[PDB]
RNA sequence: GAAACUGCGAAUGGCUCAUUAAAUCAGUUAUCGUUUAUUUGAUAGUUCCUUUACUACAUGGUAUAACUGUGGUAAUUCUAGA
RNA sequence: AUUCAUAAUAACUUUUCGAAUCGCAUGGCCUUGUGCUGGCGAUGGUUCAUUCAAAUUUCUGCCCUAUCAACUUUCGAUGGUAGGAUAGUGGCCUACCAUGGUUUCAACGGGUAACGGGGAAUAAGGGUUCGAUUCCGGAGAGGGAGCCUGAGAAACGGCUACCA
């Protein structure tokens, strides 16, 4: 469950069309933009003092939530921003009117203002493709058993 | 495939036409207009299905030709208009004024009015937004845009648009409590009042409808339309009077109709 | 081969063939739009000054322009160039042509006189056609007459007289952007919708605001 | 009222079912992720010039078809020269 | 739910759009110049809206097959950064940087006499087989790719190339 630096790549990561002035003395440390999800979910505390950037994210970030809302478990951990969901549920047969067991996976883009691991039950939100599998953002968390 | 539809077969046009299944392999397909193509109804199922007045499409369209019909005041001489929702077809040679709302059953019916309120229009509001120069404009559901509205206009409010002036006059502020005309899925074309209403923030927030007659339902909300106060509905109602009766007591009214 | 000779200034055309090798060869190794002199193929031709225009090989295909290294060959045409009307809008097409270098089977060279000579030829020296069609732009009538500006161009067009069977009548051609009372009435017309809808969007905005003053005055 | 120039449409219809087995497709979604002729409805007061010796607005230019005539090739909804 | 609509500033742009158009009527004026106004409706012309649409896209759902138990990565396989491309998101492609992603809840590979769905047949109920075919959606114009025109076509009653 790693982290980096400020700064990385090749690049400077800030956001687009934020302007820290250097002219006027700027008081506060950083112009930090964030939204608000909606759904009635709450952008973490982390989010606002934080100093990712990632502009996939919900929070301080460029893309938007809408669509389907859905929760799910954690199987996997090991990329780079993504997780890998598990939504366990049950499939019906008609014939012999008995329910099968049955699961996808459906991998979303873990935002570093969330900390996750395996077991973390949590709550994410459709969010216009980011790559391939990924087109959900994760909103909110919550842990295993303990 | 290619690009756009412009031929549309029966079995495909919607059921509020009552297009008999055969003569002919093809359904009249709209031409883009003010109203939607499930929505809307031809000039010319309307004037050979439901007023009789012509045989052939020969005969629709030196009907239209003639340019006697006003379709929102204006002269239409396009077979495939599609006239839709509010509409105020009025002539000059039989000196009648049709508009076009539904029935109980769901199909757009005949309503024969007077010259007076032959001259407005009601429309859902759609969305409200801001537009050059600082100009703020509402739309409607035929896609009126207006603009300089009343501030106190918000969206899913209705408006009474004349013919000509454009120039909203009397709109409603939609809240609890009102008479609407619900024009969507099986609710289609009944009346009722705006008991309570809910948002489902996110997805296709909903409103309780109870009508006159103690019966409850449940509606979305792309289907409401604001026709007035409580007991005062800005235009003229048909038979029925958007009620929907039981089919039993529906049978016995047509049985005890039936004969004197 | 057979060739066809042209003069304009009168406005006349005319075949010829000859057949002696020992004159048609001397046109050899020249490209189209070269000039040149026909004291070779005839005395006649002494002191006309010709110019090269084009021409069919034994098989009809024809030249063009920069079409070198010539001997017959495909090329994919496309609009506004020639040897090909295209028979579908926006269509191009591969087809056949000639090179404009003259070599031996060019069947039929067509050339245009560019400067007189001194000898008399029969069909295309006293012989002359005028045009057909007569000017038909108000300005190429002022400067096909050398009109003024105000000098009434109405009256001046070129009428042309016919008979049905004895009933002698004139025609005349429709001018076209001829500056009518119909132009003044249509101009001043849409230049007064122009100010009168921007009077009244005008006004329509200080009514609003007055308006917002009023919901403003809570 | 032929021929053409123009603008439109020939992307619709029609036919078959070879392929393609989470692909299509059916329900159910999104465009806060974008294009869209058309029809409908709105919409447009400013274009050049150290703002005096201005520079068509009662209005500016040639450049091509159909046509005329000379032709090709056995031959195309072929075309060239003028 | 917004960096949304919009508004303003500083400029930039092979400076896009701002009717050199047409048909009926022929009307009102005085300072008669043969001057000044003047309607009805036809195409266009910029953005926005509506409509007809289209493309992506969430979820969930497919017949046989283990005599198919591991698959995916040169050449993108999963994910990031940033750029190009595009109508626009997007590994769609490129550089760089991580080894990921799937799977005995059946992945990957094979068959099919596989277009799918609306439905059809047979029907006690539970079902089983079929659906090339009168409708929607798809896909293709001999096989395969490329591209002009155009709002829209990888158009074939269009073109070009090869192969048959």
């Known amino acids: ?146 | 495939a290619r690009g756009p539809k412009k031929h549309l077969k029966r079995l495909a046009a919607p059921h509020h036409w009552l297009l008999d299944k055969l003569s002919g392999c093809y359904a009249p397909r709209p031409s883009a207009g003010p109203h939607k193509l499930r929505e809307s109804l031809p000039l010319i199922v309307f004037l050979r299905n439901r007023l009789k007045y012509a045989l052939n499409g020969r005969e629709v369209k030196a009907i239209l030709m003639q340019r006697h019909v006003k379709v929102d005041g204006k002269v239409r001489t396009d077979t495939t208009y599609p006239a839709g929702f509010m509409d105020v077809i009025t002539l000059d040679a039989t000196n009648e004024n049709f508009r076009l709302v539904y029935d109980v059953k769901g199909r757009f019916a005949v309503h024969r009015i007077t010259d007076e309120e032959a001259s407005y229009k009601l429309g859902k509001v759609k969305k409200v937004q801001l537009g050059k120069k600082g100009v703020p404009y509402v739309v409607t559901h035929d896609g009126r845009t207006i603009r300089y509205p009343d501030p106190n206009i918000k969206v899913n409010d209705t408006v009474k648009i004349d013919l000509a002036s454009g120039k909203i006059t009397d709109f409603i502020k939609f809240d609890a409590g009102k008479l609407v005309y619900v024009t969507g899925g099986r609710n289609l074309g009944r009346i009722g009042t705006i008991v309570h209403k809910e948002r489902h923030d996110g997805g296709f927030d909903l409103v309780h409808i109870k009508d006159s007659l103690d019966n409850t339902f449940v509606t979305r909300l792309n289907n409401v339309f604001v026709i007035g106060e409580q007991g005062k509905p800005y235009i003229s109602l048909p038979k029925g009077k958007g009620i929907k009766l039981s089919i039993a007591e529906e049978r016995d009214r047509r049985r005890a109709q039936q004969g004197l | 081969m057979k060739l066809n000779i042209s003069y304009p200034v009168n406005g006349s055309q005319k075949t010829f063939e000859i057949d002696d090798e020992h004159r048609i060869r001397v046109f050899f190794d020249k490209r189209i739009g070269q000039e040149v002199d026909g004291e070779a193929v005839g005395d006649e031709f002494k002191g006309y000054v010709f110019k090269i225009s084009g021409g069919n090989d034994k098989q009809g295909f024809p030249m063009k322009q920069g079409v070198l290294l010539p001997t017959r060959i495909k090329l994919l045409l496309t609009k506004n160039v020639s040897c090909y009307r295209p028979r579908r809008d926006g269509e191009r097409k591969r087809k056949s042509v000639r090179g404009a270098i003259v070599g031996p089977d060019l069947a039929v060279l067509a050339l245009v006189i560019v400067k007189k000579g001194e000898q008399e030829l029969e069909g295309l020296t006293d012989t002359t056609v005028p045009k057909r069609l007569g000017p038909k732009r108000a300005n190429n009538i002022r400067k096909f007459f050398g009109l003024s500006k105000e000098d009434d161009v109405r009256d001046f067009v070129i009428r042309r007289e016919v008979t049905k069977g004895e009933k002698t009548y004139t025609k005349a051609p429709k001018i076209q952007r001829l500056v009518t009372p119909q132009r003044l009435q249509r101009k001043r017309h849409q230049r007064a919708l122009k100010v009168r809808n921007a009077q009244a969007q005008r006004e329509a905005a200080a009514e609003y605001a007055q308006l917002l003053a009023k919901r403003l005055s809570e």
């Open chain 1, 1 to 146: 469950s790693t982290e980096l630096t400020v700064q990385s790549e090749r690049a400077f990561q800030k956001q687009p069309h934020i302007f820290n002035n250097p002219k006027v003395k700027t008081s506060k440390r950083t112009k930090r933009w964030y939204k608000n999800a909606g759904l009635g979910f709450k952008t973490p505390k982390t989010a606002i003092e934080g100093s990712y950037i990632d502009k996939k994210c919900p929070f301080t970030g460029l893309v938007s939530i809408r669509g389907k809302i859905l929760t799910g478990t954690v199987v996997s951990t090991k990329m780079h921003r993504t997780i890998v969901i598990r939504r366990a549920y049950l499939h019906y047969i008609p014939k012999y009117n008995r329910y099968e067991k049955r699961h996808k996976n459906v991998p979303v883009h873990v935002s570093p203002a969330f900390r996750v691991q395996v077991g973390d039950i949590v709550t994410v939100g459709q969010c216009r493709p980011i790559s391939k599998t990924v087109r959900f953002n994760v909103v909110k968390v919550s842990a295993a058993a303990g």
